[PDB]
Amino acid sequence: SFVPFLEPFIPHENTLLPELPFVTLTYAQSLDSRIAAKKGERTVISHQETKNMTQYLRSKHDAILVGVKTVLADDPGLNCKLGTPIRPIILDPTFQLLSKIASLKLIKLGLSGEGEPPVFITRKGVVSPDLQANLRSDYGISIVEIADRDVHRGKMSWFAILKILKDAEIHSVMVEGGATIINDLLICRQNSVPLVASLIITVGPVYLGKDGVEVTPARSVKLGNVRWWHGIQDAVVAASLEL
Amino acid sequence: SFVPFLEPFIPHENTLLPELPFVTLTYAQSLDSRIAAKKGERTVISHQETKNMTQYLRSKHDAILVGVKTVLADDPGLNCKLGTPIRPIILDPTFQLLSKIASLKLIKLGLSGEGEPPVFITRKGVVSPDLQANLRSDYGISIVEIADRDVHRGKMSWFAILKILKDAEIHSVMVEGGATIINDLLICRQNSVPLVASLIITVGPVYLGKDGVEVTPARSVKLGNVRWWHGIQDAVVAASLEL
Numbered sequence: 299s300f301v302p303f304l305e306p307f308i309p310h311e312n313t314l315l316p317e318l319p320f321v322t323l324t325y326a327q328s329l330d331s332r333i334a335a336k337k338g339e340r341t342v343i344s345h346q347e348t349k350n351m352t353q354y355l356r357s358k359h360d361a362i363l364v365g366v367k368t369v370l371a372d373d374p375g376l377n378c379k380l381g382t383p384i385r386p387i388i389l390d391p392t393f394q395l396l397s398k399i400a401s402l403k404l405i406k407l408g409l410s411g412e413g414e415p416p417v418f419i420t421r422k423g424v425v426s427p428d429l430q431a432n433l434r435s436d437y438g439i440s441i442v443e444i445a446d447r448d449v450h451r452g453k454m455s456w457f458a459i460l461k462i463l464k465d466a467e468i469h470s471v472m473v474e475g476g477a478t479i480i481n482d483l484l485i486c487r488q489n490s491v492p493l494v495a496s497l498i499i500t501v502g503p504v505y506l507g508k509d510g511v512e513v514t515p516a517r518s519v520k521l522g523n524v525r526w527w528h529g530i531q532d533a534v535v536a537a538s539l540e541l
Numbered sequence: 542s543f544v545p546f547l548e549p550f551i552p553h554e555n556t557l558l559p560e561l562p563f564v565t566l567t568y569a570q571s572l573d574s575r576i577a578a579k580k581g582e583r584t585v586i587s588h589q590e591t592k593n594m595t596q597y598l599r600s601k602h603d604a605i606l607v608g609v610k611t612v613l614a615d616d617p618g619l620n621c622k623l624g625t626p627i628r629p630i631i632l633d634p635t636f637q638l639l640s641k642i643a644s645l646k647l648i649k650l651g652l653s654g655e656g657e658p659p660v661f662i663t664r665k666g667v668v669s670p671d672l673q674a675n676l677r678s679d680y681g682i683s684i685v686e687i688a689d690r691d692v693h694r695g696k697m698s699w700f701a702i703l704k705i706l707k708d709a710e711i712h713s714v715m716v717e718g719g720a721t722i723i724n725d726l727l728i729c730r731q732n733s734v735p736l737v738a739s740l741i742i743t744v745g746p747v748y749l750g751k752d753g754v755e756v757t758p759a760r761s762v763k764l765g766n767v768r769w770w771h772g773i774q775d776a777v778v779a780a781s782l783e784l
């Protein structure tokens with residue numbers, strides 16, 4: 299199955315950037331490299347054989363990270379079906395989700411103990427210190443702020459985010475999407491060294507077409523240590539990013 | 542290997558559109574569904590194991606088809622390294638390749654006997670009857686014209702093309718690219734029946750990025766009879782198109 303297949307790619311000590319958590323970038327794509335169907339169309343890409351794999355990967359990571367738009371589009375739970383704890387991290391620069399906090403599935407799971415209470419990553423001063431105290435008391439939420447010095451062209455530095463997480467004793471983070479985060483992380487380097495340690499992609503045998511949500515990085519990206527797995531319907535490629 | 546994997550997908554007689562050849566649509570893609578690198582960058586997608594697979598598929602087809610821009614970009618051979626004959630078919634509506642005829646690898650192979658002399662598919666009256674006689678004498682070229690009735694908004698009808706090829710006793714055609722032709726054939730139906738009988742895709746473990754040549758159909762497309770294979774570097778998916 300996928301367990302021996304993934305054994306070299308689950309978080310491990312041989313990190314080229316030890317001030318950062320072990321970063322897994324992982325997503326499910328159609329053949330034409332879409333990760334969501336067009337607006338109004340149901341998204342069916344990954345089948346249960348590879349959904350199980352994703353749950354297994356979540357059991358090996360301290361944290362799971364997605365962007366606001368993923369939260370808005372999917373209302374994900376962001377816990378682990380095996381029952382191991384995993385900390386949800388939401389990249390929400392202006393805290394758009396504030397008005398939905400009481401409705402979110404990830405908030406509910408944090409309150410029911412079926413999940414861990416989330417961390418939202420925002421720009422400086424987006425959430426006032428007393429709003430943070432109320433949200434922390436009412437929902438268990440933490441707010442983590444990125445200084446303006448670490449924001450370039452309106453994008454928070456991935457290095458700054460990961461260093462904060464690592465300093466909060468998050469030793470491994472599973473970044474699951476969406477397309478913006480995937481595209482940025484695929485090309486993000488620190489002195490030629492990729493921040494992503496493991497890249498694990500489910501390929502579903504479907505086309506979602508030109509109006510689906512596309513993944514493609516701004517330049518070409520070479521992979522190393524490639525290994526393929528497949529089941530009845532889906533295939534999975536695991537790899538590292540080349541220098 | 543890939544031989545028993547491909548046995549259900551190589552040309553066979555159980556065809557739903559017997560006035561057409563058996564059509565295999567087959568290409569090599571990056572993970573981000575690009576079939577060629579950005580302008581001026583080298584395109585390395587398919588590794589030797591699947592290059593061998595492509596040559597094996599050519600040995601099962603009467604004909605191989607590409608568009609002009611593929612020929613311009615790649616100057617391809619379009620023969621079969623196993624030594625079996627395969628007829629090159631070039632979709633070239635205005636015969637842009639006229640000026641390059643003497644230089645093209647595929648013409649040289651036709652003249653050397655390592656390949657078969659090509660067929661060019663043009664609009665009506667693009668190549669005068671005595672230019673065709675000369676080109677047929679000087680290079681072995683055949684010109685096939687598509688009637689104006691079968692051309693809509695500049696695009697020739699695939700149903701008309703394949704009918705002509707079938708009527709010329711091409712019983713199976715391997716359509717290899719490029720993106721324009723792949724995108725069109727992925728959605729092309731005749732009374733809900735796809736013209737493509739087999740879809741065979743090599744996925745190479747690489748991203749070519751946003752400036753590469755993208756494959757993605759204009760709407761979502763479902764697959765049937767999905768089967769996966771993988772080697773040391775590449776994966777391969779074989780499927781039919783769903784009704």
Ligand SMILES: NC(=O)c1ccc[n+]([C@@H]2O[C@H](COP(=O)([O-])OP(=O)(O)OC[C@H]3O[C@@H](n4cnc5c(N)ncnc54)[C@H](OP(=O)(O)O)[C@@H]3O)[C@@H](O)[C@H]2O)c1
Nearest residue numbers: 325326333334365367368371453454474475476477478479
């Ligand atoms: N099939 C799969 O595996 C899979 C997995 C995950 C998600 N998805 C899909 O992905 C789609 C969404 O993708 P998306 O690209 O639209 O959204 P996304 O990547 O989840 O979120 C993007 C947003 O997050 C913020 N953000 C991300 N990186 C940032 C950075 N470095 N600095 C600052 N802010 C940053 C920005 O928020 P602001 O707009 O507030 O600046 C940005 O607009 C959904 O349809 C979802 O279903 C699919």
Ligand SMILES: NC(=O)c1ccc[n+]([C@@H]2O[C@H](COP(=O)([O-])OP(=O)(O)OC[C@H]3O[C@@H](n4cnc5c(N)ncnc54)[C@H](OP(=O)(O)O)[C@@H]3O)[C@@H](O)[C@H]2O)c1
Nearest residue numbers: 568569576577608610611614696697717718719720721722
């Ligand atoms: N990795 C792989 O498997 C693979 C395989 C093949 C090709 N490729 C790459 O693909 C690129 C070519 O893609 P592309 O989309 O530019 O070219 P293409 O599909 O080979 O040719 C497109 C051109 O062919 C003509 N054409 C196609 N369908 C037609 C139709 N139904 N009716 C009339 N004319 C039609 C038109 O020529 P006019 O402009 O004269 O109308 C059109 O602009 C090249 O870079 C090549 O390297 C990659």
